[PDB]
Design an enzyme around this catalytic site. Structure first.
Site, PDB file in Angstrom:
ATOM      1  N   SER A   1      59.620  -3.195  18.026  1.00 48.72           N
ATOM      2  CA  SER A   1      60.511  -3.666  16.982  1.00 48.72           C
ATOM      3  C   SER A   1      59.863  -4.735  16.147  1.00 48.72           C
ATOM      4  O   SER A   1      60.421  -5.086  15.130  1.00 48.72           O
ATOM      5  CB  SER A   1      61.854  -4.144  17.551  1.00 48.72           C
ATOM      6  OG  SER A   1      61.654  -5.057  18.601  1.00 48.72           O
TER       7      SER A   1
ATOM      8  N   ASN B   1      59.416   0.768  23.598  1.00 49.71           N
ATOM      9  CA  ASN B   1      58.576  -0.113  24.406  1.00 49.71           C
ATOM     10  C   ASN B   1      58.517   0.378  25.854  1.00 49.71           C
ATOM     11  O   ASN B   1      58.475  -0.418  26.791  1.00 49.71           O
ATOM     12  CB  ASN B   1      59.086  -1.568  24.361  1.00 49.71           C
ATOM     13  CG  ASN B   1      59.233  -2.117  22.900  1.00 49.71           C
ATOM     14  OD1 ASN B   1      58.300  -2.022  22.082  1.00 49.71           O
ATOM     15  ND2 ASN B   1      60.401  -2.710  22.586  1.00 49.71           N
TER      16      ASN B   1
ATOM     17  N   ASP C   1      53.537   7.991  13.770  1.00 47.83           N
ATOM     18  CA  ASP C   1      52.853   8.110  12.483  1.00 47.83           C
ATOM     19  C   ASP C   1      51.809   7.033  12.182  1.00 47.83           C
ATOM     20  O   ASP C   1      50.921   7.296  11.370  1.00 47.83           O
ATOM     21  CB  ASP C   1      53.877   8.097  11.337  1.00 47.83           C
ATOM     22  CG  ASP C   1      54.955   9.180  11.492  1.00 47.83           C
ATOM     23  OD1 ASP C   1      54.625  10.382  11.352  1.00 47.83           O
ATOM     24  OD2 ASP C   1      56.142   8.821  11.730  1.00 47.83           O
TER      25      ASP C   1
ATOM     26  N   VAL D   1      61.068  10.806   9.649  1.00 46.66           N
ATOM     27  CA  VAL D   1      61.021   9.368   9.366  1.00 46.66           C
ATOM     28  C   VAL D   1      59.672   8.790   9.804  1.00 46.66           C
ATOM     29  O   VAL D   1      58.785   9.531  10.235  1.00 46.66           O
ATOM     30  CB  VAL D   1      62.197   8.626  10.024  1.00 46.66           C
ATOM     31  CG1 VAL D   1      63.553   9.254   9.598  1.00 46.66           C
ATOM     32  CG2 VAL D   1      62.040   8.600  11.557  1.00 46.66           C
TER      33      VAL D   1
ATOM     34  N   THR E   1      40.156  -5.226   6.811  1.00 47.20           N
ATOM     35  CA  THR E   1      39.451  -4.149   7.499  1.00 47.20           C
ATOM     36  C   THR E   1      38.944  -4.533   8.899  1.00 47.20           C
ATOM     37  O   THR E   1      38.448  -3.657   9.610  1.00 47.20           O
ATOM     38  CB  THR E   1      38.259  -3.655   6.659  1.00 47.20           C
ATOM     39  OG1 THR E   1      37.384  -4.745   6.351  1.00 47.20           O
ATOM     40  CG2 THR E   1      38.725  -3.000   5.366  1.00 47.20           C
TER      41      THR E   1
ATOM     42  N   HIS F   1      67.218 -11.391  17.112  1.00 57.17           N
ATOM     43  CA  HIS F   1      66.307 -10.256  16.961  1.00 57.17           C
ATOM     44  C   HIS F   1      66.331  -9.699  15.541  1.00 57.17           C
ATOM     45  O   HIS F   1      65.280  -9.440  14.954  1.00 57.17           O
ATOM     46  CB  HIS F   1      66.676  -9.184  17.989  1.00 57.17           C
ATOM     47  CG  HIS F   1      65.787  -7.988  17.971  1.00 57.17           C
ATOM     48  ND1 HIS F   1      65.963  -6.949  17.084  1.00 57.17           N
ATOM     49  CD2 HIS F   1      64.716  -7.660  18.733  1.00 57.17           C
ATOM     50  CE1 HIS F   1      65.047  -6.020  17.311  1.00 57.17           C
ATOM     51  NE2 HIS F   1      64.271  -6.432  18.299  1.00 57.17           N
TER      52      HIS F   1
ATOM     53  N   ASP G   1      70.307  -3.948  12.521  1.00 57.21           N
ATOM     54  CA  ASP G   1      69.992  -4.632  13.780  1.00 57.21           C
ATOM     55  C   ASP G   1      71.059  -5.638  14.161  1.00 57.21           C
ATOM     56  O   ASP G   1      72.229  -5.296  14.093  1.00 57.21           O
ATOM     57  CB  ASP G   1      68.564  -5.187  13.601  1.00 57.21           C
ATOM     58  CG  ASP G   1      67.925  -5.666  14.807  1.00 57.21           C
ATOM     59  OD1 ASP G   1      68.604  -6.109  15.702  1.00 57.21           O
ATOM     60  OD2 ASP G   1      66.764  -5.280  15.005  1.00 57.21           O
TER      61      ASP G   1
ATOM     62  N   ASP H   1      40.287   2.412  14.578  1.00 58.39           N
ATOM     63  CA  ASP H   1      39.957   1.035  14.909  1.00 58.39           C
ATOM     64  C   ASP H   1      40.628   0.525  16.175  1.00 58.39           C
ATOM     65  O   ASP H   1      40.285  -0.558  16.651  1.00 58.39           O
ATOM     66  CB  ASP H   1      40.327   0.130  13.734  1.00 58.39           C
ATOM     67  CG  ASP H   1      39.271   0.159  12.639  1.00 58.39           C
ATOM     68  OD1 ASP H   1      39.624  -0.121  11.478  1.00 58.39           O
ATOM     69  OD2 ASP H   1      38.087   0.461  12.936  1.00 58.39           O
TER      70      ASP H   1
ATOM     71  N   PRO I   1      61.215  13.756  13.321  1.00 57.20           N
ATOM     72  CA  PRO I   1      59.913  13.907  12.623  1.00 57.20           C
ATOM     73  C   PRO I   1      59.832  13.415  11.172  1.00 57.20           C
ATOM     74  O   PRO I   1      58.772  12.929  10.750  1.00 57.20           O
ATOM     75  CB  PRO I   1      59.634  15.414  12.693  1.00 57.20           C
ATOM     76  CG  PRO I   1      60.843  16.063  13.191  1.00 57.20           C
ATOM     77  CD  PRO I   1      61.828  15.049  13.676  1.00 57.20           C
TER      78      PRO I   1
END
Length: 279
Positions: A224, A161, A200, A177, A16, A69, A39, A260, A175
């Site tokens: 990523s 990014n 999300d 996913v 937390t 990656h 990937d 937060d 939307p």
């Protein structure tokens, strides 16, 4: 279970509060779930994967990860020291060449591959796919990712990014996913992270330490790198029976650390992935 001196993002997703360095998680650890990493490939022979990673598909002359990656992302999903779900199965789908790029048609063909190949795999606790890739808006790439979600896979994709609204990118802008942004260890939005109403959830994205090719490790940044934290969490949560593929993103958002993060623009959610594990 308690992993001492864990990478900061692992500790964060079981905390937390920022600033701790022990990762707490239920010992089931995603056993019986499967995460597809779509990937540059995965160096399956890395000791950190313990025989749980393997290449299932490539569109190039080799299924080897000559980039790193895809290996790094798979390490955040499920490697023993750097992974969220330390007992999940990892399946590599090499859609990006060794320079990190790939044609949209190759990317679409890989998503359709996973929506079928899951019927060739033992994953009684559920299927996840982690798409740490993206480019400009495409309705065909969005629809490919929608189809994968629709088939029963939890799809986690990076916001991108560009430090901009993710509405202009794909599959970030689809939307249905789970679109993931990046935060850093002081609970700031990563300076590069895309934002916007389509996001999300946020995961740890800046200076994330994970596996690398050649049996090594290194720390890199990017949305990523946040995506596989959420992918791994989904697999972990499905193994515990707390959610399904169809509702994992909504469950993660409902159970997240609210309010937060700083430098979250108006209209973007202020939610940080949290496993809510009480030791």
């Amino acid at each position: 279970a308690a992993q001492t001196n864990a990478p900061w993002g692992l500790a964060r997703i079981s905390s937390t509060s920022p600033g701790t360095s022990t990762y707490y998680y239920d010992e089931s650890a995603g056993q019986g779930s499967c995460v597809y990493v779509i990937d540059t490939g995965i160096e399956a022979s890395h000791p950190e994967f313990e025989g749980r990673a393997q290449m299932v598909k490539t569109y190039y002359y080799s299924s080897r990860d000559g980039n790193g990656h895809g290996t790094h992302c798979a390490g955040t999903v499920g490697s023993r020291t750097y992974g969220v779900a330390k007992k999940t199965q990892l399946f590599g789908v090499k859609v990006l060449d060794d320079n990190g790029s790939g044609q949209y048609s190759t990317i679409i063909a890989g998503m359709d591959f996973v929506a079928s190949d899951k019927n060739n795999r033992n994953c009684p606790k559920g299927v996840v796919a982690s798409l740490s890739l993206g480019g400009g808006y495409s309705s065909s790439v969005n629809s490919a990712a929608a189809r994968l979600q629709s088939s029963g896979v939890m799809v986690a994709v990076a916001a991108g990014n560009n430090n901009a609204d993710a509405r202009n990118y794909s599959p970030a802008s689809e939307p249905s996913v789970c679109t993931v942004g990046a935060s850093d260890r002081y609970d700031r939005r990563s300076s590069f992270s895309n934002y916007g109403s389509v996001l999300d959830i946020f995961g740890p994205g800046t200076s994330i330490l994970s596996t690398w090719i050649g049996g090594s490790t290194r720390s890199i940044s990017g949305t990523s790198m946040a995506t596989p934290h959420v992918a791994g969490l989904a697999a972990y949560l499905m193994t515990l029976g707390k959610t399904t593929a169809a509702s994992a993103c909504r469950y993660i958002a409902d159970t997240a650390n609210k309010g937060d993060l700083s430098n979250i623009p108006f209209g973007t959610v202020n939610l940080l992935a949290y496993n809510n594990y009480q030791a």
